[PDB]
């Protein structure tokens, strides 16, 4: 009787596949050749932020596009002033094993999660003048990939429990829990409209969920290894994944398919962190060969190289202003590339 | 130039930087050990000697160096996705029990795990400190059981000393490099602090070797 359900499952998978192929009538490569490429992109280092004495594993900008919080493995996450390279704050962590550090869009809070299965929320603007822990969001049973803020009261986390949860700062329990991934989810990206989010796991599959409802609407496949990074396209209708095959594939939410792969034979290492630009024409990528790449999100040809780091770039993010790009690698240095 | 508030903001950052380096130099004078091993392979007993939901960090001190141990093999998770977090550790403490050589393939699983982590890209230079636990019961069970059961292509006398020597050399041959990475062997001698003295000596050795390598003299 179970084989009948298996037969139905593969039949539905086949019918979805051919419907997906039928809707596929062209490729992005055959049309972007019509429009001229930008050419060569030079990313000169502007700010080097030398405060950490251990490898950093994540960083995040603020919506102000000037403050950025970076968390390293030395046990302290630092709030930086990009324009003047100043340490606004230094928050000692209760566990040095930290994988992520988010920033509230209002700038009031900073979150942090790691191998302790807790995303602890810190309060910045306080009466006493010292950064204090607001909440500890335990109850995940698995190491934490990344926390992301919706508001000052809602946060979405993706842990090694092979699940994603929507917490509530004032209460402390996860109101909505997203499940369906098989392996541990290693990345999460929030759509600009803040209504859907895409998570990347070890299943080599990326799927998006209805934040309001709580279940996935569709799941994309095609990757060969674990997806280490996912970032949304600024228009909110696409996202570019990142695996250990050095391929930054790009998918469509409305077309429910994949537009174009970003494969270069010179790179066979892993991808650590991908991102887009404010316009979305060029997508950056953080590779495992100590240097950062700058692709072309429409033409799929490398439009530059950002190679100022002597170690693998563990994270990179672009200001919503669009001016600078912060790349933080294991040499404990944050470098700003305008 | 800079205004009054900008000047005071810079002074605040420099004060933060001083405290960061102060805590940084304090943490540098401290040795981190990645403890792991098979289930009930002496880890539950090693922590009781080296103490007095993802990371169980055991904190204790000795003559000096303020050893720190992060028990990671007890929790049940994936294999090698957080293994990059522990790169740069001073040493790895592998606890392999000799009483699992007859229980069913546990000895094979421990040896394969040893081979996987000894040749790993991250731990190319980090030393591994062995701990062969349950020595007395190992002698009793090899008295009650033969030795060729574990290894089909190996033959030898059924004595404690040759079996301990043969398993020790078998473990040490599992690595692909010998010049940079070093393996230190022991047998968890009784329950006193003699194990703590051994790990202190081994950690002292690897610190000296890496210090000379930094000086370009090794």
């Amino acid at each position, epitope marked *: 009787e179970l084989d009948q359900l298996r037969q139905e499952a593969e039949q539905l998978k086949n019918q979805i596949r051919d419907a997906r192929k039928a809707c596929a009538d062209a490729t992005l490569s055959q049309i972007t050749n019509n429009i001229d490429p930008v050419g060569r992109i030079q990313m000169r280092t502007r700010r080097t932020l030398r405060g950490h004495l251990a490898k950093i594993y994540a960083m995040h900008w603020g919506t102000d596009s000037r403050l950025l919080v970076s968390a390293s493995q030395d046990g302290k996450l630092i709030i930086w002033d990009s324009y003047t390279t100043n340490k606004v704050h230094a928050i000692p962590l209760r566990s040095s094993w930290v994988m992520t550090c988010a920033y509230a869009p209002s700038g009031n809070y900073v979150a942090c999660g790691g191998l302790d299965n807790i995303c602890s929320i810190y309060n910045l603007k306080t009466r006493e003048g010292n950064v204090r822990v607001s909440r500890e969001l335990a109850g995940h049973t698995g190491y934490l990939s990344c926390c992301r803020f919706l508001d000052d009261n809602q946060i979405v986390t993706s842990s090694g429990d092979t699940t994603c949860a929507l917490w509530d700062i004032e209460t402390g329990q996860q109101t909505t829990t997203f499940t369906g991934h098989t392996g541990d989810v290693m990345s999460l990206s929030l759509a600009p409209d803040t209504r859907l989010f895409v998570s990347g796991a070890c299943d080599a599959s990326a799927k998006l969920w209805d934040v309001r409802e709580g279940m996935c609407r569709q799941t994309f496949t095609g990757h060969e290894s674990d997806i280490n990074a996912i970032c949304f396209f600024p228009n909110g209708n696409a996202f570019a994944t990142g695996s250990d095959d050095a391929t930054c594939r790009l998918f469509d939410l409305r077309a429910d398919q994949e537009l174009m792969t970003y494969s270069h034979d010179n790179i066979i290492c892993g991808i650590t962190s991908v991102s887009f630009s404010k316009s979305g024409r060029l997508l950056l990528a953080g590779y495992d060969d100590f240097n950062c790449n700058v692709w072309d999100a429409l033409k799929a040809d490398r439009a530059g190289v950002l190679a100022g780091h002597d170690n693998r770039v563990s994270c990179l993010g672009v200001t919503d202003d669009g001016m600078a790009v912060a790349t933080g690698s294991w040499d404990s240095f944050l470098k700003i590339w305008n | 130039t800079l*205004s009054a508030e900008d000047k005071a903001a810079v002074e*605040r950052s420099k004060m933060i930087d001083r405290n960061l380096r102060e805590d940084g130099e304090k943490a540098a004078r401290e040795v981190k050990l990645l403890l792991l091993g098979a289930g009930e392979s002496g880890k539950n007993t090693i922590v009781k000697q080296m103490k007095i939901t993802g990371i169980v960090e055991t904190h204790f001190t000795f003559k000096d160096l303020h050893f720190k141990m992060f028990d990671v093999g007890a929790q049940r998770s994936e294999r090698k996705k957080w293994i990059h977090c522990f790169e740069g550790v001073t040493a790895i403490i592998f606890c392999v029990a000799l009483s699992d050589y007859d229980l069913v393939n546990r000895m094979h699983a421990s040896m394969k795990l040893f081979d996987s982590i000894c040749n790993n890209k991250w731990f190319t230079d980090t030393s591994i400190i062995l701990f062969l636990n349950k020595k007395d019961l190992f002698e009793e069970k090899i008295k009650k059981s033969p030795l060729t059961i574990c290894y089909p292509e190996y033959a030898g006398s059924n004595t404690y000393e040759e079996a301990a020597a043969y398993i020790q050399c078998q473990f040490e041959d599992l690595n692909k490099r010998k010049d940079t990475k070093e393996i230190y062997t022991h047998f968890t001698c009784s329950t006193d602090t003699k194990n703590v003295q051994f790990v202190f000596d081994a950690v002292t050795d690897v610190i000296i070797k890496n210090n000379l390598k930094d000086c370009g003299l090794f």
Partner: single-chain antibody
Amino acid sequence: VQLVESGGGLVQPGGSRKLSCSASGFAFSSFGMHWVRQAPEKGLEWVAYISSGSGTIYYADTVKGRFTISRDDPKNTLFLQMTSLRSEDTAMYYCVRSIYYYGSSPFDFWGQGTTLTVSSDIVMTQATSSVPVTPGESVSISCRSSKSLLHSNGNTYLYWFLQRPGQSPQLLIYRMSNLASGVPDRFSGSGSGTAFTLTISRLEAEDVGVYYCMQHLEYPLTFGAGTKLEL
């Protein structure tokens, strides 16, 4: 949080006295500290300042050498010891906390104050000193400067303080535009170099007091003469 000072009393001219302020409820080491002198009838005047960790000390040119300040961070106490007092030092002294980073609000909290009786700067001028108002009426208060307070980084370092009759003044707006935390949104502020204004919308009770404009572009921090509201 609260700042409580003590050690004020009548002295003879040429004598000495030391003023101590006790802090509690906040990280006293992370905050700079200011002393401000409020004359018996006149407006606010600045005295001295100590940075965090006592790495920087500034004095008003009227009390240079004659006064000296110190802090003991472990016991959360601030000191102001004065020697050879003059007859013009009879006033009320406040201890004001101020912490400086990006997006901070210096002079956020003011001490209660201790009485005391003895028997080239950027001049901040307020054209008016007393304007009658009634509840429910919008009133604009303007205070000029002898130099432009706009800096090259975009910050216009101008502050406004409201001293209700009976207690210490409090911060209303910092950098002439940013409302301080805990104040009603009815207040407002804008302007430019050498021309600043504070427009209050829908005036009500508990808003009556003397409004002081303070510049923080450079030391000493000259205050304004103050504009008093009446009903």
